[PDB]
């Protein structure tokens, strides 16, 4: 239970490209996937939207155990029949209606937001929430395309220095922050492909 608050646990998260070779044949490439050291949140406030409802405001409202920072090393090594998708799975002891708000940011400024409402399914004593094969927004598709066309890996990392994603999962009725995940990216250079590290966000 890494990315987990008292109320909600993210078991899985992935962004991928699926290509249909033929009617019966599919190839899937994972850009990033999940399937704890502390970071001072003040060191990252400039990288996310601020003011009301922003990262500082959300953190101050708490609970503090709902706040995480994920560092991804993305695997960008991949090639009409293309689908860019995102999937995630969550578990909770409580039967809630939850909203997942995902904000893509450049220089700490929101450029696009995707919002999904998710209902519970009873599963072996707990409740399960799944976002299955959500279409990745055009901005992100275009961003990946432009990234891949950069001549050098250092150039890709330079662009990514100012690119962040903020995911806020909320109980729709109460507006309680169930999970808040700040995402930071570099390009993977490893032979093992996509890698990650998860940190707890703390006040100081």
């Amino acid at each position: 239970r890494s990315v987990a608050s008292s109320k909600l646990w993210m078991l899985e998260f992935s962004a991928f490209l699926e290509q249909q070779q033929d009617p019966d044949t599919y190839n899937k490439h994972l850009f990033v996937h999940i399937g704890l050291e502390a970071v001072d949140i003040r060191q990252i406030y400039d990288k996310f939207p601020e003011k009301k409802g922003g990262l500082k405001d959300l953190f101050e409202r708490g609970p503090s155990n709902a706040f995480f920072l994920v560092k991804f090393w993305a695997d960008l090594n991949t090639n009409g029949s293309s689908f860019y998708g995102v999937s995630s799975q969550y578990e909770s002891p409580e039967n809630m209606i939850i909203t997942c708000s995902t904000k893509v940011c450049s220089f700490g400024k929101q450029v696009v937001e995707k919002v999904e409402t998710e209902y519970a399914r009873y599963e072996n004593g707990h409740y399960s929430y799944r976002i299955h094969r959500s279409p990745l927004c055009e901005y992100m598709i275009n961003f990946i395309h432009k990234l891949k066309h950069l001549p050098e890996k250092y150039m890709m990392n330079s662009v990514l220095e100012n690119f962040t994603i903020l995911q806020v999962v909320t109980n729709r009725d109460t507006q309680e922050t169930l999970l808040c995940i700040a995402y930071v990216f570099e390009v993977s250079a490893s032979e093992h492909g996509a890698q990650h590290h998860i940190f707890r966000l703390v006040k100081e």
Binding site: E37, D46, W73, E161, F199
Partner: protein
């Protein structure tokens, strides 16, 4: 005044002479754990 739009983002790195984006502190120069910069 500096731009935040997509083309400007990539232009700033492709053609640094014409870069017109906000200037920021690189993550590597910030107070962050070693594991932030070294993959597992």
């Amino acid at each position: 005044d500096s731009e935040t739009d997509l083309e400007a983002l990539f232009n700033a790195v492709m053609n640094p002479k014409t870069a017109n984006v906000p200037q920021t502190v690189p993550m590597r120069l910030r107070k962050l754990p070693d594991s932030f910069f070294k993959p597992p």
